[PDB]
Amino acid sequence: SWDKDVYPEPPRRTPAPSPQTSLPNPITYLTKAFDLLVDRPVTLVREFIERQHAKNKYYYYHREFRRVPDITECHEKDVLCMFEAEMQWKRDYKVDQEIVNIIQERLKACQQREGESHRQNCAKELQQFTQVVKAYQDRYHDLGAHYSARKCLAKQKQRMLAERKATKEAA
Template sequence: MAEKDNPLYKFATAIYYIIDTPVTFIREKFVVPNQKKYPWYHQQYRRVPTIDECYTDDVVCYTEANCQFMRDKSVEDEILFILRSRFEQCAFYHGDDDYLCDDLRKTYDDATAAWFAKYGDMGIGLNVKNAYMKQKHRMIWERRHGPVGSGMRDQPTKA
């Protein structure tokens, strides 16, 4: 006898659909359309224009861009903290077998390198304008000499 011909199976399936059909209908027709698309549980700030979109004499735009930059930095600091904590916990748990944590180590090292490329060597003058100038100078350097860390070319190319 096939499973679908079994009376117990038919009874269980009927009970399942009696309970599931109204629940699925209400969820699909009322709950899901009225949900927020991104249910965040922390404060969300609107993205403001970046420093390269501001006029030179627009103090309000500069201040908003600087606040956005500082918020982004604090988020990236917390991401690094979480990645470092995960790696340290993995290394502590596995002890001598820390090769099991190589993927976490690589992720943390990549994130650290990206953080340093953006915020490193900024000193006390950490603001959006100095970070923008650092990014501009790095791009000019890479255009003339190749990627940073690869050594200088023999003949710099004209920018």
């Protein structure tokens, strides 16, 4: 399974079958045949495999990286600190990439699960997607193929100079 809060789904509301005609639809018979012929043998095989998993239980872990000093508190041309800052920045870069991927999955799943009323009923996912793409674009865009924490800090300083100049000229 997964976590229902990071991958949200609204509650499924299926309608009850209200057959009007007297003709028996083939789909109920095919659902019964799929449950009797397919779902039960696959379920038995999976329960056997699950018992064989339960006979020897072992674990893997999620690797925790502690927060080393970033590039702003590294001395210039001091490789033993700015190496660690650069590795921290590259890991956070991959994590921010996957956050953008998660929100894209949310947007596409909303569009499919809402179907035809998706333009009204997916305004929240579109707003979250616009926010996270604007943040990712202000954070990591236009750095180049030799991207680094120095390049990203220089882009941030240029953008903050633009923000401070726009604050000064409009006051």
